[PDB]
Design a protein around this ligand. Structure first.
Ligand code: MG
Ligand code: MG
Ligand code: MG
Ligand code: MG
Ligand code: MG
Ligand code: MG
Ligand code: MG
Ligand code: MG
Ligand code: MG
Ligand code: MG
Ligand code: MG
Ligand code: MG
Ligand code: MG
Ligand code: MG
Ligand code: MG
Ligand code: MG
Ligand code: MG
Ligand code: MG
Ligand code: MG
Ligand code: MG
Ligand code: MG
Ligand code: MG
Ligand code: MG
Ligand code: MG
Ligand code: MG
Ligand code: MG
Ligand code: MG
Ligand code: MG
Ligand code: MG
Ligand code: MG
Ligand code: MG
Ligand code: MG
Ligand code: MG
Ligand code: MG
Ligand code: MG
Ligand code: MG
Ligand code: MG
Ligand code: MG
Ligand code: MG
Ligand code: MG
Ligand code: MG
Ligand code: MG
Ligand code: MG
Ligand code: MG
Ligand code: MG
Ligand code: MG
Ligand code: MG
Ligand code: MG
Ligand code: MG
Ligand code: MG
Ligand code: MG
Ligand code: MG
Ligand code: MG
Ligand code: MG
Ligand code: MG
Ligand code: MG
Ligand code: MG
Ligand code: MG
Ligand code: MG
Ligand code: MG
Ligand code: MG
Ligand code: MG
Ligand code: MG
Ligand code: ZN
Lengths: 140, 37, 174, 204
RNA sequence: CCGCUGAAAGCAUCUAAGCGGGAAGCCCGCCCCAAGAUGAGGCCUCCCACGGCAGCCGGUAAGGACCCGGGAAGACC
RNA sequence: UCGAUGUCGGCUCGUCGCAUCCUGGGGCUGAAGAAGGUCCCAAGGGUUGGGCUGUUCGCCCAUUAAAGCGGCACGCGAGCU
């Protein structure tokens, strides 16, 4: 007898509020959903996971002096192009990217996990234009 | 301000402080004033 | 040997109504609002206000005397209101009242005009003395400190801006 | 943030108070507003200006159409003047008084694939004492094995010129309404008869 | 670095709650590029609902490309 | 690494470190003032031209806001000498 392989499955849409929630300890549930490792039919080489619609992403909470001491960084390719960006300002500029960048790193590397991040959609504020999907809100 | 690894009290008037994770030493004699660095 | 326990003699007729995280005060001179730690408790008694900490942990001992003194200060403010006199020392150094603002003539290449923020009201009984007055303390306290910074006291001369009752400790030249 | 599209005729000099003032002349006006950008509709404020009437035989349907919704005659060129809202249907140099200041934009002359002593002002090698075929060469482009690579943004020979250049704080010397001519003291990029924008200055 | 208010620690303390001042340096602003930004964005106008049997073949539309006369554009492109 | 990794100095071209030469912001000063001395913050930009010598370096002339020290195989010979 062989192992079960699930035919194409209509994905499910989830809605997760992040207000008050702790950063890194939220992105661990998302990525899990994305991976689909909450499904009895999990399969490693397919996008058999939820889509995750995160909201109020500007209200994520964090422990300690991280707003002042967590340094998001970029390298502009050229010399001296090391951009050091504190957490405080990423929010006061592009907040939906504090969570994104967090989950992003919790998703595998290569193509698959690179198109699972696509299934992640994190918006700042209490609303999302994905109403036409009727997302199944979750509590975690 | 003095800056050194040997912050100590120089007179009866000096006072040892911890401020912002740092150890200063204030006094009415501005000389004795120290920081630990 | 303790402040957070010392009661706060609310003098009639000044009001005090508690609200989680804060306390609001009304007086003959103006309202005030004291943001306060939730962990504490503000207790209302007849013509008296106290504050109880829930434990003897260091972090509760600290915020305790703190909170008592804030509220206490906020009461004297809305009732007596605070003030501070500034002393001007310097031959050509003046200080006259411009309608409501304050210009200081203290030797710079120009007069230093300072606009009074809210709550604060400048006054000048003498072109040498200045009295900053308000209901808040860390504001009357600040502004004055700012004005003194324009032309601080010197180390070699009674010449500059001095807090009232501020020592005139000077050094020798030559 | 007033601005106007225009072409470059040339540059001479004039006299102003016993003093010679180099000037470059520009045929700025007249530019008709062919569309107004908005925050609700387009999400931002500007004004699409037209300049130089064009022969309708060379103008095609979508363009001909767009020129219609604005009740605007055809034209040769279309550029925007961001954060600018003229009260009327037509813009002219009259929006500039003498003695003002402006920032000028022009597609600089094109020097083609120019060398390094010409694009990046290098000094090349000597012309003697043993120079072996390097009189106009750059030199060394890196180190050795560490980093063992060449930098990005490095300076090398390449196309130089014929690129957008914005000159700033020029002086409105005079404006000739009669002809739509703006006189500006200084150098304006690009060849004569080339296109230029004349936007209010952002300096102080 | 300099402070305001201020406990712990009845005084004192720029800090432990909180609020200020302060570098040619960090962020934005200025100039230039840039939606291959595959997160491939937005706006204006134009075209259309063609025949035969999310594919194919054939003829058009709005358009473009080749060809040519050339250009302070350019090695060819 | 010797079935080869060419080794000093210069020219050209940079770029980084900061134990900072300059410009900036501070404390102390036996800081009156001007000008100095000594620690602290700061690497954005700048840091000249010459005479001797192969020279790096150093000395010297004239200046300067100043004429900083160092890493990149004592940066850089399929780039030159
Ligand atoms: Mg779960
Ligand atoms: Mg697991
Ligand atoms: Mg998935
Ligand atoms: Mg946390
Ligand atoms: Mg954003
Ligand atoms: Mg000692
Ligand atoms: Mg002693
Ligand atoms: Mg003291
Ligand atoms: Mg009462
Ligand atoms: Mg009780
Ligand atoms: Mg012209
Ligand atoms: Mg142009
Ligand atoms: Mg050319
Ligand atoms: Mg050049
Ligand atoms: Mg040259
Ligand atoms: Mg040369
Ligand atoms: Mg030579
Ligand atoms: Mg030469
Ligand atoms: Mg030879
Ligand atoms: Mg030769
Ligand atoms: Mg070369
Ligand atoms: Mg080589
Ligand atoms: Mg490498
Ligand atoms: Mg080009
Ligand atoms: Mg004239
Ligand atoms: Mg003090
Ligand atoms: Mg105090
Ligand atoms: Mg604090
Ligand atoms: Mg501040
Ligand atoms: Mg501040
Ligand atoms: Mg101050
Ligand atoms: Mg500030
Ligand atoms: Mg400057
Ligand atoms: Mg562009
Ligand atoms: Mg596109
Ligand atoms: Mg990306
Ligand atoms: Mg598009
Ligand atoms: Mg040709
Ligand atoms: Mg070998
Ligand atoms: Mg060998
Ligand atoms: Mg070999
Ligand atoms: Mg070999
Ligand atoms: Mg240092
Ligand atoms: Mg300095
Ligand atoms: Mg200095
Ligand atoms: Mg002296
Ligand atoms: Mg002296
Ligand atoms: Mg001095
Ligand atoms: Mg000093
Ligand atoms: Mg620097
Ligand atoms: Mg330098
Ligand atoms: Mg020399
Ligand atoms: Mg000689
Ligand atoms: Mg020697
Ligand atoms: Mg000698
Ligand atoms: Mg001199
Ligand atoms: Mg000096
Ligand atoms: Mg060696
Ligand atoms: Mg050696
Ligand atoms: Mg070598
Ligand atoms: Mg070499
Ligand atoms: Mg050679
Ligand atoms: Mg050599
Ligand atoms: Zn002392």
């Amino acid at each position: 007898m062989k192992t079960y392989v699930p035919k194409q499955v209509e994905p499910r849409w989830v809605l997760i509020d992040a207000e008050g929630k702790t950063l890194g300890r939220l992105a661990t549930k998302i990525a899990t959903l994305l991976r689909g490792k909450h499904r009895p039919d999990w399969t490693p080489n397919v996008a058999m996971g939820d889509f995750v619609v995160v909201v109020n992403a500007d209200k994520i909470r964090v422990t300690g002096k991280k707003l002042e001491q967590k340094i998001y960084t970029r390298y502009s390719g050229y010399p001296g192009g090391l951009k050091k960006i504190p957490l405080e300002k990423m929010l006061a500029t592009h907040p939906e990217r504090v969570l994104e960048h967090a989950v992003k790193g919790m998703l595998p590397k290569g193509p698959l996990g690179r198109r699972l991040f696509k299934r992640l959609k994190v918006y700042a504020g209490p609303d999302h234009p994905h109403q036409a999907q009727r997302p199944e809100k979750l509590e975690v | 301000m003095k800056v050194r690894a040997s912050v100590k009290r120089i007179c009866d008037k000096c006072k040892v402080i911890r401020r912002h994770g740092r150890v200063y030493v204030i006094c009415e004699n501005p000389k004795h004033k120290q920081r630990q660095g | 040997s303790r402040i957070g326990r010392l009661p706060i003699p609310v003098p009639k007729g000044v009001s005090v109504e508690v609200a989680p995280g804060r306390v609001k005060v009304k007086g003959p001179k103006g309202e005030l609002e004291v943001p306060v730690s939730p962990e504490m408790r503000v207790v209302v008694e007849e013509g008296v206000v106290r504050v109880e900490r829930p434990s003897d942990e260091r972090r509760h001992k600290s915020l305790h005397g703190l909170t008592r003194t804030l509220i206490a200060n906020a009461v004297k403010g809305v009732s007596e209101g605070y003030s501070k006199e500034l002393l001007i020392k310097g031959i050509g150094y003046r200080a006259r009242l411009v309608g409501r603002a304050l210009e200081l003539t203290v030797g710079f290449s120009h007069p230093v005009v300072v606009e009074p923020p809210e709550g604060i009201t400048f006054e000048v009984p003498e072109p040498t003395r200045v009295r900053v007055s308000g209901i808040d303390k860390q504001k009357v306290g600040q502004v004055a400190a700012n004005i003194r910074a324009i032309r601080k006291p010197s180390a070699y001369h009674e010449k500059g801006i001095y807090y009232a009752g501020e020592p005139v400790r000077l050094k020798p030249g030559k | 943030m007033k601005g106007i599209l225009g072409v470059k005729v040339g540059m001479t000099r004039i006299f102003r108070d016993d003093r010679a003032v180099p000037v470059t002349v520009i045929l700025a006006g007249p530019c008709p507003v062919v569309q107004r950008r908005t925050p609700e509709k387009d999400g931002y404020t500007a004004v699409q200006l037209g300049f130089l009437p064009q022969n309708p035989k060379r103008v095609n349907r979508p363009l001909k159409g767009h020129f219609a919704k604005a009740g605007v005659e055809p034209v040769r060129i279309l550029r925007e003047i961001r954060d600018f809202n003229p009260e009327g249907d037509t813009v002219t140099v009259e929006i500039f008084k003498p003695g003002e200041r402006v920032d000028v934009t022009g597609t600089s002359k094109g020097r083609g694939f120019a060398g390094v002593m010409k694009r990046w002002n290098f000094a090349g090698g000597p012309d003697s004492h043993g120079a072996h075929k390097i009189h106009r060469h750059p030199g060394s482009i890196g180190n050795r094995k560490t980093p063992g690579r060449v930098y990005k943004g490095k300076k090398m020979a390449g196309h130089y010129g014929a690129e957008r250049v914005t000159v700033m704080n020029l002086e409105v010397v005079d404006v000739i309404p009669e002809e739509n001519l703006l006189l500006v003291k200084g150098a304006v990029p690009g060849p004569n008869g080339g296109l230029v924008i004349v936007r209010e200055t952002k300096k102080a």
